[PDB]
Amino acid sequence: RSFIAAVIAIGGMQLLATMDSTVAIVALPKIQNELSLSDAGRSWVITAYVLTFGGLMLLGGRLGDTIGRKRTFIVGVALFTISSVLCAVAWDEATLVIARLSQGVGSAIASPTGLALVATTFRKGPARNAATAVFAAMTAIGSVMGLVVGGALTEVSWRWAFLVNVPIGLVMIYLARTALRETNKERMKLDATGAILATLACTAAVFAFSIGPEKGWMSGITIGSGLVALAAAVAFVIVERTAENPVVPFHLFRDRNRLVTFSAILLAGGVMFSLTVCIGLYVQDILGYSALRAGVGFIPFVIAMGIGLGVSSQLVSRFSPRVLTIGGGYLLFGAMLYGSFFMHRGVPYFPNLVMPIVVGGIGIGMAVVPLTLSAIAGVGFDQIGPVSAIALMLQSLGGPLVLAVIQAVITSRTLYLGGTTGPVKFMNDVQLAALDHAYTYGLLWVAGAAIIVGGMALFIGYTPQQVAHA
Amino acid sequence: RSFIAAVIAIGGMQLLATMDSTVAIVALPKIQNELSLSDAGRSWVITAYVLTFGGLMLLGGRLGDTIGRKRTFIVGVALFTISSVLCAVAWDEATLVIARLSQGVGSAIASPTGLALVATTFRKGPARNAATAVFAAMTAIGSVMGLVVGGALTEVSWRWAFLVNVPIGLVMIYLARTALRETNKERMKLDATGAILATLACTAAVFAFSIGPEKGWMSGITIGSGLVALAAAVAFVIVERTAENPVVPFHLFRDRNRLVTFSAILLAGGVMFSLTVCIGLYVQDILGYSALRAGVGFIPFVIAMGIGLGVSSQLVSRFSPRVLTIGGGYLLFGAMLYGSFFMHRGVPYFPNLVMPIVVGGIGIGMAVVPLTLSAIAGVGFDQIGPVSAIALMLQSLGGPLVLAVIQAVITSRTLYLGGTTGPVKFMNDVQLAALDHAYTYGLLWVAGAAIIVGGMALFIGYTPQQVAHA
Ligand SMILES: CC/C=C/CC/C=C\C=C\CCC/C=C/CCC(=O)OC[C@@H](COP(=O)(O)OC[C@H](O)CO)OC(=O)/C=C/CCCCC/C=C/CC/C=C/CC
Ligand SMILES: CC/C=C/CC/C=C\C=C\CCC/C=C/CCC(=O)OC[C@@H](COP(=O)(O)OC[C@H](O)CO)OC(=O)/C=C/CCCCC/C=C/CC/C=C/CC
Ligand SMILES: CC/C=C/CC/C=C\C=C\CCC/C=C/CCC(=O)OC[C@H](COP(=O)(O)OC[C@@H](O)CO)OC(=O)/C=C/CCCCC/C=C/CC/C=C/CC
């Protein structure tokens, strides 16, 4: 039981954080009808979590080296679980935003430690390959369970949806206490000066990006915050040259395979994030399956993805990460080509929608394990901290960049085919049909980004005896 | 002057075959007004040329070994030039059909000899690379010059357009005679039984594939035509086992890098053929440029292609055919993504149409040179005949296969967007707008087929020392 209890506990924060993201999105309209927070406050509950989760990520990367990775994992999760209760008792806009702020602080501390715990706890070999599959398995499980939970326990109250994290979170705190052993190495000094500038630079950059669309791109306060971030970013690099125990080891990023792998995960995250957002919007708006029925209909995705991850964990020892990334990428290509020809409003569920989801899930799951193992290959125990923190930063940061281009193509083609921009419930059956054909057309431009991802994967060059097979 | 006159004469049949093909398509509607051979006779003049050109392709490969490579190239061109004069004096469908039949026979003899002449005449190294670029360069020149000649000298008569091949064709016979030296090796016995079975199989398959859409797929004679095609093909393989100097050396095609490099050009030719048909139809119908203006507007394509071919000849000695094929093909991906977003009816010619054509021309030209050098590498002199005939047979055969799939996607999406199937001259500006967006949508599926070509190009693995640099 020691093995299964360890992989479940380590990947728990991936289950918790991803599930919370979808439930908060689903319950947003009912928050309007109760708190009466207006349209300006609608975005302030979402970006409040993102403000601290991305701002504190680098600080939480080096936090486990000076205190302890296991202690960091329990503390970070506990603050996440406590914050959910404070989120479900919110009475005023100030109460909710502060509750969402502290969830990001709790997530930023524990999330990078989860990836680092895979490399240190499990030795290189079949154990790490099985641990990588489980770590990637429950990220998609939380997303699907988020739709089912958020689509079922929402008509009685949005407050009960946030209270489902507590039973799940308490188990992972219990499992991590009795299934993970505290390692014994001497603690190292924290880069306090480096962490101060790194935190205030990423938080300012996210604040400027969020306030842009609201107050205008050239309001005067947005540029002022960007100037502060650019001044901090310049100073942060300067100190790191002669700073012991760097937050970011720039010397570790050379012309080696590390840049190619870290550039691939930056773009591969954007392809996956944009694919999830567009498919969920297409099913809920064009097909009208709502939250509950869409989540149950995505159950085959988890089973197919679980099949792909389990198979890829066996083949990684024999095949290089280059061929498994491409091999699973071609199964993705056939899914969205078949998912473009056979999608309009009113099609049956089994002949038309089941196959693209199942086949695409196997291809996606096949290429996740080789990419994860190569990003934590040949780094060591003193430097696995910041490397894991950077890997989760680039994976999440690439999402909005790619989706911004994809959503621009969707909007442009809607106008050309004949349509309007606005809420969907106010669109007759010619502007609605144009939006149907716009999303399907934009599914092919997602494949255009996937080709770019695969082209960068040609330069990995890792052999199977380095990433695995030890 | 010896070098430039030699290579021009070698690639001369490529100029003739492509340019005559385009002119025959352009002047087809005027043949209706004069010969009055009805709809059923419209497709016979196109079918008649293809029936013998593809039917006698395999015979022409081994015909140069038993007779002479230079002598075969002269008679093949001479019969082509002669048949153009008889074509332009046609006075009934029977006279025009016979002339088109004889034009294919002359082309089937000289076309495979042109590619074989590249390998034997020029020694492997810098001389072959420069000769390869000019060989591919004049294939694209003939296509554009066919539009201008057939779009300008056709308002006076369709008979004058057919007589423009004689001044050019007579020059090619002169340059070949003066600038090509007759090699001195002993002639070999021709496989009489194999040549008879090879000829009958291809014409029967072409005849069945042509009468199918006309008379019905299960009409009764198409299955009979398919019966002799299978009977000839089955006996051809049986008798080829013990046949001296085989027509098709099956033993040469093993699990080595030759089957991969022959499957790539099978589908690369289909992508390039479907790109020309779709673009030419889109420009003439949606934009209404007619034939003369379309030919002038595609002049920058040839200039851009010439730059791509010239650069690729220098780089092929330092880079393998794998990287140049994948690297050159990414420029094609960028052009067709740009050409899908910024191309509708009524756009200016400069910013929206010239840029994708110029960039796409460079990308195509960079990938053509490595593919043909790999297709004639390391075979010898006693087997360069059949191998070059197969390379031209598969390149032409892949065209209709890929285009049939693309045209099915275009027709399916036209109906969904709102529109009908029929002549463009009866549209109510609403079905015309839908046909505009259907062609643009189908441009991305051509990119999907080009991705498959890239995938097979990863298995080439030819060293630049083997295909060049000697
Ligand atoms: C090593 C460093 C880091 C490693 C750490 C990383 C470790 C592993 C991570 C891997 C990737 C992400 C995990 C997966 C998360 C989400 C996936 C999921 O399970 O979530 C369900 C849904 C989301 O939706 P959701 O966002 O909730 O929607 C709500 C709206 O926003 C408003 O309510 O996604 C999907 O089903 C995905 C479907 C793609 C399959 C391919 C189909 C192609 C053809 C389909 C045609 C249909 C027509 C579409 C026409 C466009
Ligand atoms: C070694 C083995 C063998 C080696 C032996 C062979 C050695 C090398 C041979 C390679 C392949 C063929 C060469 C090229 C031949 C044709 C190309 C050409 O020069 O011909 C011009 C025109 C043809 O037209 P044509 O067919 O005459 O038209 C008539 C109508 O059918 C009815 O009159 O094509 C083009 O301009 C091609 C443009 C492609 C550039 C990239 C475009 C991307 C953006 C597109 C946006 C536009 C919107 C499209 C929306 C869909
Ligand atoms: C095969 C097993 C099972 C099959 C089983 C078959 C059944 C179905 C299919 C299964 C999966 C397919 C396998 C995909 C394999 C691909 C990986 C690969 O085999 O790769 C080849 C080559 C080797 O490399 P090399 O190390 O020399 O050789 C060592 C090896 O031969 C062994 O040791 O990779 C390259 O170099 C790539 C060359 C292209 C140059 C890049 C330029 C274009 C991109 C520009 C910028 C990027 C994008 C930016 C913005 C767009």
Those residues with Cβ within 8 angstroms of residue A279's Cβ, 6 or more apart along the chain or in another chain: none
Q: Which residue has the tokens 């701002």?
A: A55
CB A300 within 8 A of CB A361: yes
Q: Tokens in use for A15?
A: 């289950």
Rounded Cα gap, residues A15 and A6, in angstroms: 14
∠ CA B312-B295-B334, nearest 5°, is 45
Those residues with Cβ within 8 angstroms of residue A425's Cβ, 6 or more apart along the chain or in another chain: none
In the reported structure, the alpha carbon of residue A141 is separated from the centroid of ligand 1 by a whole-number distance in angstroms of 10
| Binary contact (A344, B437; C-beta < 8 A) | no
Q: Tokens in use for B218?
A: 């299960």
CB B385 within 8 A of CB B112: yes
CATH superfamily of B1-191: MFS general substrate transporter like domains (1.20.1250.20)
Is the distance from the beta carbon of residue A243 to the nearest atom of ligand 3 less than 6 Å?
no
What stretch of H or E contains A395? Answer: helix A384-417
∠ CA A40-A46-A52, nearest 5°, is 120
Residue A392 CA, closest ligand 1 atom number: 3
Of the residues A409, A435, A441, the best mutation for testing chain B's interface (the one with the most B CB atoms within 10 Å of its CB) is A441
Is the distance from the beta carbon of residue B343 to the nearest atom of ligand 2 less than 6 Å?
yes
The minimal CB distance from A330 to the residues B337, B437, B455 is found for: B455
Burial B347-371 (b: 16+ CB within 10 A, else e): eeeeebbeebbbbbbbbbbbbbbbb
Cα radius of gyration (chain A)? 22
Pairs across A and B, CB distance < 8 A: 38
Rounded Cα gap, residues B111 and B115, in angstroms: 7
Contacts of B419 in chain A (CB under 8 A): none
Chain B nearest CA to A441, separation (Å): 7
HEC states along B296-361? HHCHHHHHHHHHHHHHHHHHCCCCCHHHHHHHHHHHHHHHHHHHHHCCCCCCCHHHHHHHHHHHHH
Is the distance from the beta carbon of residue A391 to the nearest atom of ligand 1 less than 6 Å?
yes
CB B374 within 8 A of CB B320: no
The minimal CB distance from B448 to the residues A337, A412, A416 is found for: A337
Is the distance from the beta carbon of residue A388 to the nearest atom of ligand 1 less than 6 Å?
no
| C-alpha count within 13 angstroms, C-beta hemisphere, residue B127 | 14
CB A370 within 8 A of CB A324: yes
Task: Give the torsion sign (CA, B469, B257, B111, B29).
Answer: negative
In whole angstroms, what separates CA A340 from the centre of its chain? 25
Chain A nearest CA to B140, separation (Å): 28
Residues of B with CB under 8 A from a CB of A: 326, 330, 333, 337, 341, 344, 409, 412, 416-417, 437, 441, 444-445, 447-448, 451, 455, 458
**Hey, is A184 helix, strand or coil?**
coil
The resolution, in Å, is 3.2
| C-alpha count within 13 angstroms, C-beta hemisphere, residue B397 | 18
Residue B332 CA, closest ligand 2 atom number: 41
Q: Write down the domain spans for chain A.
A: 1-191, 192-243, 249-470
Instruction: Write out the DSSP string of B58-90.
Output: HHHHHHHHHH-HHHHHHHHHHHHHHHHHHHTT-
Rounded Cα gap, residues B229 and B201, in angstroms: 5
Of B21, B266, B279, which is best to mutate to test ligand 2, by the most ligand atoms within 8 angstroms of its C-beta? B279
Rounded Cα gap, residues A119 and B453, in angstroms: 38
Q: Which of A213, A219, A204 is nearest to A54 (CA)?
A: A204
* Length reported for chain B: 470
Q: Which of A363, A324, A307 is nearest to A468 (CA)?
A: A324
Of the residues B451, B452, B458, the best mutation for testing chain A's interface (the one with the most A CB atoms within 10 Å of its CB) is B451
Q: Which of A61, A39, A22, A274 is nearest to A161 (CA)?
A: A22
Is the distance from the beta carbon of residue A322 to the nearest atom of ligand 3 less than 6 Å?
yes
Question: Phi-psi region for residue A418, left (φ > 0), alpha (ψ -120 to 50) or beta?
Answer: left
Number of H helices, E strands in chain B: 21, 0
Nearest-Cα residue of chain A relative to residue B322: A458
Rounded Cα gap, residues A438 and A411, in angstroms: 8
In the reported structure, the alpha carbon of residue A184 is separated from the centroid of ligand 2 by a whole-number distance in angstroms of 68
Contacts of A441 in chain B (CB under 8 A): 441, 444
Of B263, B316, B322, which is best to mutate to test ligand 3, by the most ligand atoms within 8 angstroms of its C-beta? B322
* Length reported for chain A: 470
Rounded Cα gap, residues A385 and B232, in angstroms: 69
Topology agreement, domain B1-191 and domain B248-470: yes
In the reported structure, the alpha carbon of residue B435 is separated from the centroid of ligand 1 by a whole-number distance in angstroms of 33
Rounded Cα gap, residues B157 and A235, in angstroms: 77
∠ CA B461-B462-B463, nearest 5°, is 115
| Binary contact (A417, B417; C-beta < 8 A) | yes
| C-alpha count within 13 angstroms, C-beta hemisphere, residue B7 | 18
What is the residue type of B340? Answer: S
User: Which CATH number is B248-470 given?
Assistant: 1.20.1250.20
Burial B20-45 (b: 16+ CB within 10 A, else e): bbbbbbbbeeebeeebebeeeeeebb
In the reported structure, the alpha carbon of residue B19 is separated from the centroid of ligand 2 by a whole-number distance in angstroms of 12
Burial A453-468 (b: 16+ CB within 10 A, else e): bbbbbbebebebebbb
DSSP 8-state code for residue B255: T
Residues of A with CB under 8 A from a CB of B: 326, 330, 333, 337, 341, 344, 409, 412, 416-417, 437, 441, 444-445, 447-448, 451, 455, 458
Those residues with Cβ within 8 angstroms of residue B15's Cβ, 6 or more apart along the chain or in another chain: B138, B139, B141, B142, B168, B172
Chain A nearest CA to B339, separation (Å): 13
Is the distance from the beta carbon of residue A374 to the nearest atom of ligand 1 less than 6 Å?
no
Rounded Cα gap, residues B143 and B26, in angstroms: 12
Rounded Cα gap, residues A32 and B202, in angstroms: 72
Of the residues A416, A429, A432, the best mutation for testing chain B's interface (the one with the most B CB atoms within 10 Å of its CB) is A416
Is the distance from the beta carbon of residue B438 to the nearest atom of ligand 2 less than 6 Å?
no
C-alpha torsion B169→B173→B174→B177, nearest 10: 170
Chain A nearest CA to B266, separation (Å): 20
The minimal CB distance from A437 to the residues B417, B447, B458 is found for: B417
Nearest-Cα residue of chain A relative to residue B439: A441
Q: Which of A450, A127, A452 is nearest to A316 (CA)?
A: A127
Q: Which residue has the tokens 């954080």?
A: A17
Angle between helices B257-282 and B384-418 (to 10 degrees): 40
Closest residue to atom 30 of ligand 1, CA basis: A280
CATH superfamily of A249-470: MFS general substrate transporter like domains (1.20.1250.20)
Chain B nearest CA to A9, separation (Å): 40
Give A452: exposed, middle or buried? Use CB within 10 Å, 0-12, 13-18, 19+: middle
